[PDB]
């Protein structure tokens, strides 16, 4: 599924992301925008370590979720990666929340650092009523 902007904003809000560990809804939106274009089915294979990034947040299969085919895999979110490919993003949100409890917080995502940090992110929530 590809979310509409305000549809996704309301959904993330409903799942408790707005202000989670001090991270604004606006920044979570920018993350989803620049990881996957709001697309739950997004996948990116990394031939370098045979890992795959999954779902709207492009969560990687080496550390976070189990896809059964990534060598040296840890499953820190304790989730099947397939769970991160579903229309309902509840599981993806919980895993994203786990990611940011690590010291880097939302900086864990290099696309966020390059596309969001230090840039306008108000545009992602403007007009949504969230």
């Amino acid at each position, epitope marked *: 599924k590809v979310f509409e902007r305000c549809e996704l904003a309301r959904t993330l*809000k409903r799942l408790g992301m*707005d*202000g989670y*560990r001090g*991270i*604004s809804l*606006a*920044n979570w939106m920018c993350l989803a925008k620049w990881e996957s274009g709001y697309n739950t089915r997004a996948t990116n294979y990394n031939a370098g370590d045979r890992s795959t990034d999954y779902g709207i947040f492009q969560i990687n299969s080496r550390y976070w979720c189990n896809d059964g085919k990534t060598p040296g895999a840890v499953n820190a979110c304790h989730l099947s990666c397939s769970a991160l490919l579903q229309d309902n993003i509840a599981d993806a949100v919980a895993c994203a929340k786990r990611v940011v409890r690590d010291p880097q917080g939302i900086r864990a995502w290099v696309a966020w650092r390059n596309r969001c940090q230090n840039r306008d992110v108000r545009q992602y929530v403007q007009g949504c009523g969230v």
Partner: nanobody
Framework: QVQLQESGGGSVQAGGSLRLSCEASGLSTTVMAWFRQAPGKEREGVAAIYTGDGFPYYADSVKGRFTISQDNAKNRMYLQMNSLEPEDTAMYYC?????????????????????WGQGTQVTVSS
């Protein structure tokens, strides 16, 4: 919990400025804000800032004139109030959250906040 301590405030003439600061102790904050209670008006969110990413919200009436910022090193948040006008006269209150916003809860809603400062008087005259 979270103890909030406000500093700054006072009297100033229109066009002038004041800097308010609020320092949090206790649980770590997710959001810190200034509210204000103007005379003969209902209380109101003025500006808010997310502790983790520094994202700010501003009330329409202070956009471009007020700047909210922070130094997490000192668990300290600042409100730089520029181009002050008589109608900015009010009691300003620091507020803080330790968790996320519930659905239906907006940054400017006092109910969204669980911790409050004691209030700081700001008087702007023509």
């Amino acid at each position: 919990q979270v103890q909030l301590q406000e500093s700054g405030g006072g009297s100033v003439q229109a066009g002038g400025s004041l800097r308010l600061s609020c320092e949090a102790s206790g649980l770590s904050t997710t959001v810190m804000a200034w509210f204000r209670q103007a005379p003969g008006k209902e209380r109101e969110g003025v500006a808010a800032i997310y502790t983790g990413d520094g994202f700010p919200y501003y009330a329409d009436s202070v956009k471009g004139r007020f700047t909210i910022s922070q130094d997490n090193a000192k668990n300290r948040m600042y409100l730089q109030m520029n181009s002050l006008e008589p109608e900015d006269t009010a009691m300003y209150y620091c507020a803080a959250k330790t968790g996320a916003f519930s659905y239906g809860s907006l940054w400017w809603m006092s109910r969204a906040y669980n911790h409050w400062g004691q209030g700081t008087q700001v008087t702007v005259s023509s």
